[PDB]
């Protein structure tokens, strides 16, 4: 109909073909239950390493580690939309989505011993 109203429309740059990380824009997802807070003095550092490939995420020692696994695909796909200072949007396709994928921990000096006790059970 007629537009008595105003719309703010931004130009979308359908994905720029040539980007430095054009190849990789990925999603790292954490479950809310994990309660990971990026703003942590502790979580100032973080390392992301391929485990030889699930990704391994670790803070300084004494902190939790997470494992990242890749989710299955579909017909639709996800794009990351970022906005420049100028309103224009640049979109980038998500290369892969990973669900992380960390530790607990409190899994040391156990597991193998608990199973054995369980066996001392039958």
């Amino acid at each position: 109909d007629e537009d008595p109203n105003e719309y703010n429309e931004f130009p979308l740059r359908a994905i720029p073909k040539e980007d430095l990380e054009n190849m990789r824009t990925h999603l790292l997802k954490f479950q809310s239950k994990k309660k990971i807070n990026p703003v942590t003095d502790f979580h100032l550092p973080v390392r992301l390493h391929r485990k030889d490939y699930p990704w391994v995420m670790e803070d300084f020692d004494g902190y939790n580690t997470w494992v990242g696994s890749y989710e299955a695909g579909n017909s639709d796909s996800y794009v990351l939309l970022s906005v420049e200072d100028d309103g224009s949007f640049t979109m980038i396709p998500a290369d892969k989505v990973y669900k992380f994928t960390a530790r607990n921990k409190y899994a040391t000096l156990t597991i193998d011993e608990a199973e054995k006790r369980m066996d001392k059970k039958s």
Binding site: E9, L12, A14, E21, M23, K29, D76
Partner: protein, 105 residues
């Protein structure tokens, strides 16, 4: 840089995650990089928040059809985007502030 390190999300940069239909993405690939690959535009309408996506005329010869977007919640999850460059440096680019699905039209 520091090898194996992750970069800077601390800046709290926000980004949007949008689900697009495969056919639309296919069309988008067509756009020339040289052009800057301007696929089309996003419209934000008031009188309630409505967001739609429309393809550029160049993309197809017809009347551009708007693709409505369904806004969705973050869900009980925190989504962050990390990028890996050719250099293989890893950076924590931003957090997903809003999620949306572009419906097919």
């Amino acid at each position: 840089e520091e090898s194996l390190d992750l970069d800077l999300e601390r800046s709290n940069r926000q980004v949007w995650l949008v689900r697009l239909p495969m056919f639309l993405a296919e069309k988008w690939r067509d756009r020339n990089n040289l052009h800057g690959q301007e696929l089309g535009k996003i419209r934000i309408n008031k009188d309630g928040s409505k967001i739609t996506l429309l393809l550029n005329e160049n993309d197809n010869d017809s009347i551009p059809h708007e693709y409505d977007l369904e806004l969705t919640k973050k869900v009980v999850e925190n989504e962050y985007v990390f990028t890996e460059q050719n250099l293989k440096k890893t950076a924590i680019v931003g957090t997903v502030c809003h999620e949306c699905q572009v419906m097919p039209s």
